[PDB]
Amino acid sequence: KRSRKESYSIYVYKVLKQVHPDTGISSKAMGIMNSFVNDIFERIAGEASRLAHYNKRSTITSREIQTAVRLLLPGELAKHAVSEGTKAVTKYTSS
Amino acid sequence: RSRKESYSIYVYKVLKQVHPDTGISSKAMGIMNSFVNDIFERIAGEASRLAHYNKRSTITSREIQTAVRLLLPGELAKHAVSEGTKAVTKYTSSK
Amino acid sequence: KALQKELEQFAKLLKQKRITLGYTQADVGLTLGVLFGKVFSQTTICRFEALQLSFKNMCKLRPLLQKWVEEADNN
Amino acid sequence: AKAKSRSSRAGLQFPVGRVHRLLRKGNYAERVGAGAPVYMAAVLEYLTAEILELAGNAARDNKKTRIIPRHLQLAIRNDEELNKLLGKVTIAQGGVLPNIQAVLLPK
Amino acid sequence: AKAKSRSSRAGLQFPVGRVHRLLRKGNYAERVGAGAPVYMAAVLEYLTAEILELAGNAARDNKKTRIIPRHLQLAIRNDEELNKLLGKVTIAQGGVLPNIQAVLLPK
Amino acid sequence: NRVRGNLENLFLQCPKPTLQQISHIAQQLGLEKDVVRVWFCNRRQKGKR
Amino acid sequence: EVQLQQSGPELVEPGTSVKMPCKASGYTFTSYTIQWVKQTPRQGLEWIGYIYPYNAGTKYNEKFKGKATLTSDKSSSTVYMELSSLTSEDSAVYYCARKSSRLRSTLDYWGQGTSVTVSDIKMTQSPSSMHASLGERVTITCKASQDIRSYLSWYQQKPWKSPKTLIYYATSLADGVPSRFSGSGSGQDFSLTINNLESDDTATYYCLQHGESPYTFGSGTKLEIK
Amino acid sequence: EVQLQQSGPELVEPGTSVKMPCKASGYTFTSYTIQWVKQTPRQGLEWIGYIYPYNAGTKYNEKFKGKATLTSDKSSSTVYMELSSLTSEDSAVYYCARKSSRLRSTLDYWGQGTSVTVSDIKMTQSPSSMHASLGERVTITCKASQDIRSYLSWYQQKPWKSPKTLIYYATSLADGVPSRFSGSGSGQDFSLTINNLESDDTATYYCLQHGESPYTFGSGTKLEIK
Amino acid sequence: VLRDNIQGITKPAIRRLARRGGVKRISGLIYEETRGVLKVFLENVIRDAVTYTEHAKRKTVTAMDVVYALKRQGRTLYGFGG
Amino acid sequence: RDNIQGITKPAIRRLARRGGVKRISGLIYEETRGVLKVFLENVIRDAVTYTEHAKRKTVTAMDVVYALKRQGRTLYGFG
Amino acid sequence: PHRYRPGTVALREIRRYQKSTELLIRKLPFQRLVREIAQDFKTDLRFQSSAVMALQEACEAYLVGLFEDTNLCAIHAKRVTIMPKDIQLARRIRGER
Amino acid sequence: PHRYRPGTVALREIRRYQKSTELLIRKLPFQRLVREIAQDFKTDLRFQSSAVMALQEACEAYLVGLFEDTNLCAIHAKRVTIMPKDIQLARRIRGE
DNA sequence: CCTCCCCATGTGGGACCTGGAGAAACAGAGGGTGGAGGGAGCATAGAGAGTCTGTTCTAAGCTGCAAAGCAAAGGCCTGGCGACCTAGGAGACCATGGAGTTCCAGAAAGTGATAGTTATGCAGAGCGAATGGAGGGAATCAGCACG
DNA sequence: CGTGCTGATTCCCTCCATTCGCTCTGCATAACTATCACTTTCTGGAACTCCATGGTCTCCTAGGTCGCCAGGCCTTTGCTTTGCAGCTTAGAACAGACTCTCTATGCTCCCTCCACCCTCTGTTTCTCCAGGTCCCACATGGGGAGG
């Protein structure tokens, strides 16, 4: 009757089977991946929250997430992450 | 113009309470305002994380006491905990 | 050293009496202007009780509240 | 009424709905616009894809077909950017990069 | 009933109401438990009083009536706990501690 | 050998005797039901290869 | 902003070794790999190797191991290439190219090309050469041998000039490239589309994969205007 | 946990110099000042000075300036005290006490003290010596000559023992002290109250101010029960 | 009641930790210094973890409290939750 | 635009004298200029990012303070 | 018999322990040390196995990284033997002191 | 004439510049450096005076702290002269 | 030439990893509603960039030389290499008790809305802090003299 | 070859005069306080299940000790080379002032988008057992050596 824990171990495996079809993963490496996704989520979300608070805004938009990615991630990493976020938002607001 | 608030009168009241001959400059008042805002942000962020870890949706004086025990070093934390407990006891005992 | 303690203490008794009778800060300033003909704004009423302004200025206007406090005791 | 979850509408595998819920419940802002979880899920999915592909390559040049945390540490520490992002981060069971200073070698 | 404030109820100088408003609108939690701003204001007032007392003592030993940021830097850096609290903090126009290493002196 | 013949009688007649036949046959041969189940599982595995 | 300085043409007698520098300026030198390719009239562009200055990590082509060695000098921000035992088929234009450590990124910026004169995924490009008018649409096909997950790049090269990056990640535009050029395709089938041409589109176009360990360039399509 | 180890007694010839160790354990040594108090039966307790091991910061009393020298050694966590030119009035017990750099903090933990034998603001305590029953109320006054911002502490000392800290900041109880003791007052008027008596409370009670640069102890009250 | 357990961090263990750190030669006074440094780091992390445990009204120190303590001291640890 | 030579030799000498340095080698100054350039680029890039997020064309002291902060180099006295 | 020169075994130990991933301190003495240290903060505490495990990976990673910084300090002083002054200098520059 | 031996005026300069709090770089070259560095990120952008002042205070504090660590490295290498290798070692241990 | 013991090997069976067949339960997504956060114009004070002039003030360049760093050499001393013993760690198997989780009740309490009232931010005079200039007196340091 | 008493440079301390930053003074205003309704949220209480001590056995491998010796640290000493101290010239910064003009902030309209809520659905998470496969020890065969 104990409650259920939730993680990213299902989606991380899907991304792994996209980028490497014949490659498994251990449970410890999945724990590292879950901790990584959680850490980057808290970093970007806190950064974007600070960006919205500095500008006296009450909402987090994709512009705040883009600026937080630009501030947090180093150069080419931030460039490709901005590319991916822009492409996903463009694809989402078309259906 | 636009009425920006600070801690200058509060820090000046504290200064005239602990040193009733000693003035302060504008630059030192800016340092004191930055110090109060920085420590406020640190304690409030630690208390927010403490409330989020234990599945709590409120920040009470227990979260603030634990945060003060976390950020501040030893005797500093002990005297700050004594001051906070004394103030909360005086506030509860007097409406 | 010696001056501040007297003023800081006196601010406590007058506010305690002020709260009991149910007046306001504006009302006290209204009475002071009626009595001595030297009106005082509500801002100066609070600045006295929280000690905002000069210890010299505490000395100057202190007896007026001293007169008001004793007179408010009678009426 | 139907199908089409927000991840599939954005062409993603990371959950847009769960990221929106975590942004709402994470006490970051009063409101959350509905482009922020899409951007956020895309950035997380890109970072996961980059680290997982580099770790898969590190496992492939190890005659192995399973990623252990050693492969993740080898992927992260061999990159300038990645190391910079995760520079203050300890990976459990990852070890260190194999390097010896040149003055320690005998000659 | 004359509207007395919460700082005078707690016997403080720092504002309980403004700290409550900043805690409410600062996106920290869903609720604020109304004894938390009293504790916060007391801790901020204690830290301000300690720093200001040490800075006033430094200004008195420097034979100055007014406190400049040099006195705040000399107060902070000469205390181990205060320097531990503000290790990654730069004070503007504060200078550094007078410290010459012992080898550099003559003889 | 006699028990071996009694067990090997059911190669092509009952590929999966299951628990109902296993418990019935085990009492006849004076052996545990787990032994009979393991033997039939090994026989199925050998037939698979 | 980003420059990849190189040396002049080196006339070299067979038997000795030759050095080529790739003095780099305008960016953080340690964060980007420097890759070396060579170009001949006989077989076109082919990738020789690369050197990562963050850990000085080399990776060479299988046919260039031993023939070419790569070193880096972090203080002078330079990358040095040694070619030893120059045979007769070594007169070539040698290019160094910046490329980020990210897998999506490609050889975005190139060096001028040192002319040295001596005294696997197969790339299939269907059009070897084509002619076009001043306003029509051109399509160039780059069907590959194995599967590459969108890790294809399109380059434009003027005669006696360094190649210019047009398309990275098989669809994305490079920096400064106008929207006339459009990459498309994925998996094994890729294509480059020129929408309306100018007088500056008379050039040779190449497609390069970097999904596998040996990077292979295209056969090259010559585009001549009017 | 926290202890301050001190050496044995010294029988010193006059005109020489004597070293005093204050080996410390149980706490972070650099974060707390070490104070030195001299105790004679004729002048009572006298504060000499303190050393801060964080910056090796010294501060001495004016009557002990030059006569006393404080040093610190962070490797062995030891505090050394030097007395030179021993006058015949040096036969006294020397205690070293821990005190944090916080202004509210006091001399909380004391050493055992070394007995050396040669071969401002004034605290007024109104009862010199008083008699109390097993369940009476004890009130001790510590009227100050000047103003202090509640920076007064109350100490209890048994015969031939180190003083024990009862009250710090004039109202707050020390660690381990029961709630029978209660400090009160501020400014220039202070008081210590013993609620109900035990046989343990036969001791001498002192009050120390540390609101100004020379720290001054009180005269002390002798309290004996039945 | 345990006492004197910093000596259980033996000299070969410190030598192995130096070999993983790339150290060729090790002086004899390195081991006591390493024991002191490891002790100080352990009391800092354990003190923060025990504070996180006592806030949760628990008598059991969990791995998540250790992870929050490490994150608090700027030494974020992956692979043990969070 | 050059202007890294405006951080002159006696300015670096004064900054080293404040740091307690008694003797300075001749190759210190170019290394210090490169270090200062790297640090200034890292702070100014984040400050310009904070400025561009606010739709502003002016870098304020608040943007510099936020940029500094994000690098763990909190500066007091500018708001 | 046959003997190896000093520094030859010490280099193969560097090459061996830098390619391995597991813990270098024994589990039970570290667990006893953790319980001894934690008993000074709260009595009758009870850790999980994963808490002690996480503490061990954190402490070993910190000690290994400090040993690389110590080795750099030793090589800067034209030495190959690390000394306590190198540990003190590395902790001083890192901000740990 | 009169001439101080080397290291005397250096120690006097150490005492003088550790006693004071004023900035050690001239304001105009630092302003020009800040503007040219910001030119690579923005083509035409303005600067508050306080922004350049905060940048100068932060840069001078960073350089003074790095010179402190550099002097510690030089003393650990049994020298009194700081070299670029000391700066590189200090920035390597700091993580820069 | 006969006989007994040992090694290679086939194979039956127990244990480990995986995948399917469910399994179900939290929650994501659509659609209607409304209200408020923030775009988009529209004006405008103000401040930052630009230029100009003037006056010092510091930096750049060069010279002399001392003292710091560096490299070669020898002593020694200590840390690594190797071997023998042995004891404590590691792994597993239990027993348990006390700890952390869960559900129910509801009393406390935190939020929202409205009124008001007050104390706080902002603009502006009076003034005492201190900063620089002139002067004096002492701390410190570094080159010829007498012994 | 060892201090030693003039001489020079710098640093500290005193006495005027702003003067410019501070303290103080007055007014509007918005925000903080009171009071009432109402919806959470924690605080005991009881059940429970589960997991972390805590001890036992073995064995066997890593730790402690001892010998020994080679090379690495330490010290010395001479040599060079390289910053530091000081002086002179000029060019660059700092300060004060005025333009402008372009920017940032404020006010309004209003509108679109995002929060709230219900419903239904596809998605996510947690085990559980049948099946396949791997290792492992046991029974059997055949070869080599002894009598």
mmCIF file of C-alpha atoms in Angstrom, chain A residues 19-91:
data_model
loop_
_atom_site.group_PDB
_atom_site.id
_atom_site.type_symbol
_atom_site.label_atom_id
_atom_site.label_comp_id
_atom_site.label_asym_id
_atom_site.label_seq_id
_atom_site.Cartn_x
_atom_site.Cartn_y
_atom_site.Cartn_z
ATOM 1 C CA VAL A 19 21.082 7.300 -29.990
ATOM 2 C CA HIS A 20 22.396 3.729 -29.535
ATOM 3 C CA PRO A 21 20.051 0.901 -30.586
ATOM 4 C CA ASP A 22 22.314 -1.996 -29.554
ATOM 5 C CA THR A 23 23.468 -0.695 -26.170
ATOM 6 C CA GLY A 24 22.123 -1.446 -22.703
ATOM 7 C CA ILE A 25 22.591 0.444 -19.456
ATOM 8 C CA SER A 26 23.194 -0.542 -15.841
ATOM 9 C CA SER A 27 20.981 0.531 -12.953
ATOM 10 C CA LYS A 28 23.771 2.611 -11.397
ATOM 11 C CA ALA A 29 24.236 4.510 -14.668
ATOM 12 C CA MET A 30 20.471 5.075 -14.778
ATOM 13 C CA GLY A 31 20.723 6.493 -11.259
ATOM 14 C CA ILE A 32 23.493 8.830 -12.441
ATOM 15 C CA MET A 33 21.282 9.856 -15.376
ATOM 16 C CA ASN A 34 18.271 10.507 -13.109
ATOM 17 C CA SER A 35 20.400 12.628 -10.766
ATOM 18 C CA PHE A 36 21.789 14.514 -13.781
ATOM 19 C CA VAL A 37 18.351 15.305 -15.237
ATOM 20 C CA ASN A 38 17.064 16.392 -11.814
ATOM 21 C CA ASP A 39 20.121 18.602 -11.192
ATOM 22 C CA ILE A 40 19.937 20.321 -14.586
ATOM 23 C CA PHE A 41 16.163 20.791 -14.163
ATOM 24 C CA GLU A 42 16.611 22.518 -10.790
ATOM 25 C CA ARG A 43 19.478 24.652 -12.135
ATOM 26 C CA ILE A 44 17.623 25.895 -15.236
ATOM 27 C CA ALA A 45 14.306 26.333 -13.404
ATOM 28 C CA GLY A 46 15.869 28.259 -10.516
ATOM 29 C CA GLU A 47 17.835 30.428 -12.929
ATOM 30 C CA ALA A 48 14.684 31.186 -14.926
ATOM 31 C CA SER A 49 12.790 31.921 -11.699
ATOM 32 C CA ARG A 50 15.490 34.432 -10.758
ATOM 33 C CA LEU A 51 15.288 35.948 -14.262
ATOM 34 C CA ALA A 52 11.527 36.400 -13.934
ATOM 35 C CA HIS A 53 11.921 37.863 -10.440
ATOM 36 C CA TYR A 54 14.574 40.379 -11.554
ATOM 37 C CA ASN A 55 12.306 41.735 -14.302
ATOM 38 C CA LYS A 56 9.210 41.929 -12.060
ATOM 39 C CA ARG A 57 7.371 39.292 -14.047
ATOM 40 C CA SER A 58 5.043 36.718 -12.692
ATOM 41 C CA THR A 59 5.326 34.008 -15.356
ATOM 42 C CA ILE A 60 8.079 31.749 -16.675
ATOM 43 C CA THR A 61 7.994 31.644 -20.471
ATOM 44 C CA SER A 62 10.227 29.994 -23.050
ATOM 45 C CA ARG A 63 12.195 33.253 -23.299
ATOM 46 C CA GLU A 64 13.202 32.878 -19.636
ATOM 47 C CA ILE A 65 14.186 29.240 -20.232
ATOM 48 C CA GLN A 66 16.203 30.276 -23.305
ATOM 49 C CA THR A 67 18.053 32.964 -21.336
ATOM 50 C CA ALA A 68 18.657 30.510 -18.473
ATOM 51 C CA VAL A 69 20.112 27.993 -20.946
ATOM 52 C CA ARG A 70 22.317 30.765 -22.370
ATOM 53 C CA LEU A 71 23.564 31.750 -18.903
ATOM 54 C CA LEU A 72 24.029 28.236 -17.519
ATOM 55 C CA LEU A 73 25.359 26.133 -20.372
ATOM 56 C CA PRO A 74 28.738 26.835 -22.029
ATOM 57 C CA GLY A 75 29.035 27.970 -25.637
ATOM 58 C CA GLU A 76 28.295 25.304 -28.245
ATOM 59 C CA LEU A 77 26.282 23.326 -25.698
ATOM 60 C CA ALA A 78 24.072 26.377 -25.135
ATOM 61 C CA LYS A 79 23.859 26.991 -28.898
ATOM 62 C CA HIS A 80 22.628 23.475 -29.669
ATOM 63 C CA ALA A 81 20.299 23.437 -26.642
ATOM 64 C CA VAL A 82 18.765 26.731 -27.808
ATOM 65 C CA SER A 83 18.399 25.172 -31.255
ATOM 66 C CA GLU A 84 16.599 22.127 -29.813
ATOM 67 C CA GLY A 85 14.328 24.223 -27.590
ATOM 68 C CA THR A 86 13.409 26.583 -30.433
ATOM 69 C CA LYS A 87 12.668 23.679 -32.789
ATOM 70 C CA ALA A 88 10.519 21.925 -30.175
ATOM 71 C CA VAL A 89 8.526 25.071 -29.333
ATOM 72 C CA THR A 90 8.016 25.770 -33.060
ATOM 73 C CA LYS A 91 6.848 22.177 -33.536
#
